[PDB]
Design an enzyme around this catalytic site. Structure first.
Site, PDB file in Angstrom:
ATOM      1  N   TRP A   1       2.249  -5.230  -8.878  1.00 23.67           N
ATOM      2  CA  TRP A   1       3.196  -6.071  -9.300  1.00 23.67           C
ATOM      3  C   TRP A   1       3.411  -7.105  -8.212  1.00 23.67           C
ATOM      4  CZ3 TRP A   1       4.193  -0.569  -9.152  1.00 23.67           C
ATOM      5  CH2 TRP A   1       4.671  -0.032  -8.017  1.00 23.67           C
TER       6      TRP A   1
ATOM      7  N   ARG B   1       0.702  -1.347  -0.134  1.00 26.35           N
ATOM      8  CA  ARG B   1      -0.138   0.099  -0.210  1.00 26.35           C
ATOM      9  C   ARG B   1       0.898   1.411  -0.011  1.00 26.35           C
ATOM     10  NH1 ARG B   1      -3.997  -0.702   4.954  1.00 26.35           N
ATOM     11  NH2 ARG B   1      -2.633  -2.498   5.205  1.00 26.35           N
TER      12      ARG B   1
ATOM     13  N   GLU C   1       4.772 -14.773  -3.452  1.00 30.24           N
ATOM     14  CA  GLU C   1       3.493 -15.151  -3.942  1.00 30.24           C
ATOM     15  C   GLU C   1       3.560 -16.313  -4.962  1.00 30.24           C
ATOM     16  OE1 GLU C   1       0.519 -11.753  -4.484  1.00 30.24           O
ATOM     17  OE2 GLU C   1       2.217 -10.839  -4.759  1.00 30.24           O
TER      18      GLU C   1
HETATM   19  C1  HEM Z   1       1.674  -2.204  -6.282  1.00 36.39           C
HETATM   20  C2  HEM Z   1       2.055  -3.293  -6.003  1.00 36.39           C
HETATM   21  C3  HEM Z   1       1.392  -4.118  -5.118  1.00 36.39           C
HETATM   22  C4  HEM Z   1       1.843  -5.170  -4.362  1.00 36.39           C
HETATM   23  C5  HEM Z   1       3.455  -5.507  -4.191  1.00 36.39           C
HETATM   24  C6  HEM Z   1       0.971  -5.906  -3.718  1.00 36.39           C
HETATM   25  C7  HEM Z   1       1.007  -6.928  -2.764  1.00 36.39           C
HETATM   26  C8  HEM Z   1       0.225  -7.649  -1.930  1.00 36.39           C
HETATM   27  C9  HEM Z   1       0.244  -9.044  -1.495  1.00 36.39           C
HETATM   28  C10 HEM Z   1       1.410  -9.869  -1.400  1.00 36.39           C
HETATM   29  C11 HEM Z   1      -0.948  -9.355  -1.194  1.00 36.39           C
HETATM   30  C12 HEM Z   1      -1.249 -10.970  -0.608  1.00 36.39           C
HETATM   31  C13 HEM Z   1      -1.800 -11.555  -1.974  1.00 36.39           C
HETATM   32  C14 HEM Z   1      -2.238 -12.884  -1.417  1.00 36.39           C
HETATM   33  O1  HEM Z   1      -1.587 -13.522  -0.593  1.00 36.39           O
HETATM   34  O2  HEM Z   1      -3.044 -13.712  -2.036  1.00 36.39           O
HETATM   35  C15 HEM Z   1      -1.986  -8.491  -1.708  1.00 36.39           C
HETATM   36  C16 HEM Z   1      -3.296  -8.485  -1.157  1.00 36.39           C
HETATM   37  C17 HEM Z   1      -4.337  -7.518  -1.930  1.00 36.39           C
HETATM   38  N1  HEM Z   1      -4.126  -6.474  -2.384  1.00 36.39           N
HETATM   39 FE1  HEM Z   1      -1.917  -5.651  -2.919  1.00 36.39          FE
HETATM   40  N2  HEM Z   1      -0.323  -5.380  -3.826  1.00 36.39           N
HETATM   41  C18 HEM Z   1      -0.064  -4.360  -4.850  1.00 36.39           C
HETATM   42  C19 HEM Z   1      -1.102  -3.747  -5.478  1.00 36.39           C
HETATM   43  C20 HEM Z   1      -2.528  -3.494  -5.165  1.00 36.39           C
HETATM   44  C21 HEM Z   1      -3.430  -2.534  -5.750  1.00 36.39           C
HETATM   45  C22 HEM Z   1      -3.023  -1.696  -7.049  1.00 36.39           C
HETATM   46  C23 HEM Z   1      -4.554  -2.676  -5.222  1.00 36.39           C
HETATM   47  C24 HEM Z   1      -5.916  -2.386  -5.273  1.00 36.39           C
HETATM   48  C25 HEM Z   1      -6.222  -1.087  -6.316  1.00 36.39           C
HETATM   49  C26 HEM Z   1      -4.431  -3.948  -4.338  1.00 36.39           C
HETATM   50  C27 HEM Z   1      -5.264  -4.343  -3.221  1.00 36.39           C
HETATM   51  C28 HEM Z   1      -5.117  -5.476  -2.756  1.00 36.39           C
HETATM   52  C29 HEM Z   1      -6.422  -6.201  -2.063  1.00 36.39           C
HETATM   53  C30 HEM Z   1      -7.666  -5.929  -1.833  1.00 36.39           C
HETATM   54  C31 HEM Z   1      -5.687  -7.312  -1.323  1.00 36.39           C
HETATM   55  C32 HEM Z   1      -6.326  -8.543  -0.664  1.00 36.39           C
HETATM   56  C33 HEM Z   1      -6.733  -9.566  -1.787  1.00 36.39           C
HETATM   57  C34 HEM Z   1      -7.596 -10.614  -1.054  1.00 36.39           C
HETATM   58  O3  HEM Z   1      -8.339 -10.637  -0.036  1.00 36.39           O
HETATM   59  O4  HEM Z   1      -7.666 -11.720  -1.565  1.00 36.39           O
HETATM   60  N3  HEM Z   1      -3.095  -4.157  -4.281  1.00 36.39           N
HETATM   61  N4  HEM Z   1      -1.187  -7.461  -2.219  1.00 36.39           N
HETATM   62  C1  LIG Z   2      -6.885 -17.317  -1.584  1.00 35.62           C
HETATM   63  N1  LIG Z   2      -6.182 -16.282  -2.560  1.00 35.62           N
HETATM   64  C2  LIG Z   2      -6.575 -17.272  -3.888  1.00 35.62           C
HETATM   65  C3  LIG Z   2      -5.846 -16.107  -5.046  1.00 35.62           C
HETATM   66  C4  LIG Z   2      -4.344 -15.864  -5.008  1.00 35.62           C
HETATM   67  C5  LIG Z   2      -3.817 -15.089  -5.956  1.00 35.62           C
HETATM   68  C6  LIG Z   2      -3.659 -15.755  -7.219  1.00 35.62           C
HETATM   69  C7  LIG Z   2      -3.228 -15.187  -8.292  1.00 35.62           C
HETATM   70  F1  LIG Z   2      -2.871 -15.649  -9.709  1.00 35.62           F
HETATM   71  C8  LIG Z   2      -3.045 -13.683  -8.288  1.00 35.62           C
HETATM   72  C9  LIG Z   2      -3.204 -13.159  -7.098  1.00 35.62           C
HETATM   73  C10 LIG Z   2      -2.944 -11.620  -7.031  1.00 35.62           C
HETATM   74  C11 LIG Z   2      -2.601 -11.187  -5.795  1.00 35.62           C
HETATM   75  C12 LIG Z   2      -1.895  -9.787  -5.964  1.00 35.62           C
HETATM   76  C13 LIG Z   2      -2.857  -8.672  -6.454  1.00 35.62           C
HETATM   77  C14 LIG Z   2      -2.202  -7.512  -6.576  1.00 35.62           C
HETATM   78  C15 LIG Z   2      -3.017  -6.342  -7.057  1.00 35.62           C
HETATM   79  C16 LIG Z   2      -0.714  -7.292  -6.320  1.00 35.62           C
HETATM   80  C17 LIG Z   2      -0.002  -8.506  -5.908  1.00 35.62           C
HETATM   81  N2  LIG Z   2       1.475  -8.637  -5.618  1.00 35.62           N
HETATM   82  N3  LIG Z   2      -0.742  -9.574  -5.704  1.00 35.62           N
HETATM   83  C18 LIG Z   2      -3.488 -13.727  -5.743  1.00 35.62           C
END
Ligand code: HEM
Ligand SMILES: CNCCCc1cc(F)cc(CCc2cc(C)cc(N)n2)c1
Ligand code: HEM
Ligand SMILES: CNCCCc1cc(F)cc(CCc2cc(C)cc(N)n2)c1
Ligand SMILES: C[C@H](O)[C@H](O)[C@H]1CNc2nc(N)[nH]c(=O)c2N1
Ligand SMILES: C[C@H](O)[C@H](O)[C@H]1CNc2nc(N)[nH]c(=O)c2N1
Ligand SMILES: [Zn+2]
Lengths: 413, 408
Positions: free
Chosen positions: A283, A114, A288
């Site tokens: 990205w 974030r 991940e």
């Molecule tokens: C810019 C680089 C970003 C990085 C490095 C990043 C990193 C991550 C990571 C590592 C997770 C956990 C993913 C997982 O374990 O499935 C995550 C979850 C999440 N990200 Fe970020 N993210 C990025 C951008 C964004 C953007 C652009 C948004 C929305 C505009 C966002 C919203 C969320 C939300 C809502 C989750 C929770 C997803 C879920 O509950 O399945 N992220 N992010």
């Molecule tokens: C229980 N969770 C199931 C879905 C896991 C997942 C699979 C995937 F291919 C791609 C994502 C993307 C998660 C994500 C989203 C964003 C926006 C950035 C970032 N670094 N990673 C999640």
């Protein structure tokens, strides 16, 4: 509820004070008697439900732009109110849409990335009317975000929910995923996480290559109609072959991954308005792919095979052969992305940035909601600074929310 | 309501009914979760608490509402009435102690819960007595390497002014020394306590692994110092099975993990001195003790000896060094035939335990933040296991450090 809650960092002794929790708008799932902090997941708004939700959001927007109480503030409030009265809903201005999307991210307690929240390209797709149009918008999103490997975070926002029978949905949980195929013998080819969705695509007309890394087609629903299949042009899908700097044999595993992580199954909520199709992308953090995608037992599950090629004793768990292979696999993932100049962040850099972000947020915003269970990376937890960081979790709006899978709810025409 | 918890790897769904029994708070509310926060009587207060505990004890021995049950309730009544407190029966003491362990949400080792040796030390009156009881504990629990879980229970609290306290946070710990040149010798977590021992008359050898003396407070009096006879203190020199240079690091650790700063609560009674011990999970030493920045902090050195590129974080040099260190620790204890469990084996046992508890008990309170190991999280089965956290009594609770509340 108390006005000031304190969080402590146990590595650094730093204590932070949270007041922002007071603005919490929905339920965690927890009660005084039970904590649901590790639970993964703990027909429209009426006029009377909508009014206060809209006002809350508009107030916040005009507060953010230092125009709270202004003539334009009161005028916008009155115009919104009139619209809900006459139409039972309202339309966000572009400025408000952009503000809301950035804040939904800023508010996403499960996201470690974030620090970047204010740099987000918002694409307004509320004029979209058909699945072909959704396809065009998504292709443009992919190309812009991919940027030849220099990725840029972006969101594309399709029309809000009206009566609930005209929802726009991306049926894909993520824009780019690899197919999974269940075999007669019980084995799985490709990504076992995606077997159900793959079957749906196949049923809908998709001809499956039946490979290990077949990019799935987009399955796109516009205005509540039956979903339609489109194949993303392969040149728009940037991929990275996984190799290892020391182990020349690593490339012989035939692994690769896609550069762009793009979530497409979530619901964006702004001022009580519901955007059921709002694909967003950033990205990747290395783990991940290197820990979850590759090493989860229910996924590609390659630890054994890597362990074998590393000539590891795999008879006792106490050799830590699993842990050893895990590190090498994650080194290979980071090496391969960096070498192909595709943006990726390791879990050390990401978690350090997040701590800095969090401290800045406590300072300027009075807090930063964070879900420790998700923020801490799935490997080497305690050697990242987030492990020792006390976090408070609460739900602010605008927000990204989960929603049911569209094949469970769709009324086929 | 009934509550479901899902394991996302196996898709197993368990149903929790047990949580309906809890009454204590978690810290969370409907709007704020404090799951990652480390730390979130009278006659009229005492009886209902006593009653509930006696009620669940007799219920656990299948004699609810029995004659024995009734008299016991009656007995406890007259005693709280006449004395503003009451004394547990021996059977009740042992039951209460095993169940405090069983209910400890943060402990991954609970599969062993009913195998606990309970030492009743409620007749203790002096620090010398406490020392004697603690030496016997250590000797029994150490058992020449074949470690045995044990707890020693000192007299309960009365007026708050005559507390029994073990001032050490754990029975066996290495001292830490604040150097002139600003660095730290030994264990930086213990710097303050080490200095209180020095101020009290302890003569520090000023080494890297100096076993701290016991500092024991009996009946609200000033604490007194004692040295545990060294032959009772089992230690392991850490070496690596492949890196023959690892022993040259000069690392060791003690075999007996023994928390001594917690409060055991049973039926409204408070046991402010209850040292309890089991055996180590390798990561405790290999990850936290050795590799925490604010602890022994040895990653950098190991990384050197492994000739790793340490200019970019993305080389994962830290992760590599971390794995080798944890391999060494496991290997060393095993080679010395000293009980130790790796985080893979421990988490497996815990999932199996969870299933047992859901089946026979209707649930198992568990704190995912503590249960998931500090390395290789998602390659252990607990990472993928949803857990519910809630507070059941009898329990182990935190209490103030005694040097912040004691008048000399
Ligand atoms: C810019 C680089 C970003 C990085 C490095 C990043 C990193 C991550 C990571 C590592 C997770 C956990 C993913 C997982 O374990 O499935 C995550 C979850 C999440 N990200 Fe970020 N993210 C990025 C951008 C964004 C953007 C652009 C948004 C929305 C505009 C966002 C919203 C969320 C939300 C809502 C989750 C929770 C997803 C879920 O509950 O399945 N992220 N992010
Ligand atoms: C229980 N969770 C199931 C879905 C896991 C997942 C699979 C995937 F291919 C791609 C994502 C993307 C998660 C994500 C989203 C964003 C926006 C950035 C970032 N670094 N990673 C999640
Ligand atoms: C027998 C083998 C045991 C193993 C392998 C084990 C393992 C662990 C581990 C790894 C932790 C996390 C500790 C930390 O990170 O500081 C823990 C916490 C804890 N354990 Fe166990 N344990 C064992 C025995 C016991 C016994 C015998 C008791 C009590 C009679 C007990 C009660 C507790 C409590 C109360 C905590 C939480 C302590 C705190 O909050 O600081 N454990 N255990
Ligand atoms: C934030 N926590 C600070 C204290 C950490 C600690 C220090 C110690 F010397 C010994 C322990 C032992 C914890 C423990 C206790 C028991 C009973 C078994 C086991 N394997 N491990 C913890
Ligand atoms: C049961 C548990 O909540 C579940 O396995 C969670 C744990 N933490 C996680 N953290 C991240 N970043 N992603 C996940 O999918 C999960 N899964
Ligand atoms: C901030 C966070 O609550 C704190 O670092 C916790 C996290 N999980 C832990 N888990 C265990 N087993 N032991 C610990 O000391 C901690 N520390
Ligand atoms: Zn909670």
């Amino acid at each position: 509820c108390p006005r000031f809650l304190k969080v402590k960092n146990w590595e650094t002794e730093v204590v932070l004070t949270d007041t922002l929790h007071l603005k919490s708008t929905l339920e965690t799932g927890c009660t005084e008697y039970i904590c649901m902090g590790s639970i993964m997941h703990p027909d429209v708004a009426t006029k009377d439900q909508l009014f206060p939700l809209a006002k809350e959001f508009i107030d916040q927007y005009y507060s953010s732009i230092k125009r709270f109480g202004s003539k334009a503030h009161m005028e916008r409030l009155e115009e919104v109110n009139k619209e809900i009265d006459t139409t039972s809903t309202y339309q966000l201005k572009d400025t408000e849409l952009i503000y809301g999307a950035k804040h939904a991210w800023r508010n996403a307690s499960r996201c470690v990335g974030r620090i970047q929240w204010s740099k987000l390209q918002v694409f307004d797709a509320r004029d979209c009317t058909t699945a072909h149009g959704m396809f065009n918008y998504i292709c443009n999103h992919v190309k812009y975000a991919t940027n030849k490997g220099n990725l840029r975070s972006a969101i594309t926002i399709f029309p809000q929910r009206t009566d609930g029978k005209h929802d726009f949905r991306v049926w894909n949980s993520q824009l780019i995923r690899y197919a999974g195929y269940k075999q007669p013998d019980g084995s799985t080819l490709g990504d076992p996480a995606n077997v159900q969705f793959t079957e749906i695509c196949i049923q809908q007309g998709w001809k499956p290559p039946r490979g290990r890394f077949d990019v799935l087609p987009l399955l796109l629903q516009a205005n509540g109609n039956d979903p339609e299949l489109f194949q993303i042009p392969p040149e728009l899908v940037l991929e990275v072959p996984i190799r290892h700097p020391k182990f020349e044999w690593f490339k012989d595993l035939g692994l690769k991954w896609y550069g762009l992580p793009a979530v497409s199954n979530m619901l964006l909520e702004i001022g009580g308005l519901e955007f059921s199709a709002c694909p967003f992308s950033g990205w990747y953090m290395g783990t991940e792919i290197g820990v979850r995608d590759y090493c989860d037992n229910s996924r590609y599950n390659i630890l054994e095979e890597v362990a074998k090629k590393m000539n590891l004793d795999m008879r006792k768990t106490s050799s830590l052969w699993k842990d050893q292979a895990l590190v090498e696999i994650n080194i290979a993932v980071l090496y391969s992305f960096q070498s192909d100049k595709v943006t990726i962040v390791d879990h050390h850099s990401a978690t350090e940035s997040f701590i800095k972000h969090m401290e800045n947020e406590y300072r300027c915003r009075g807090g930063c909601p964070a879900d420790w269970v998700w923020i801490v990376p799935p490997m080497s937890g305690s050697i990242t600074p987030v492990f020792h960081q006390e976090m408070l979790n609460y739900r602010l709006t605008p927000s990204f929310e989960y929603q049911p899978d569209p094949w469970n709810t769709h009324v086929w025409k």
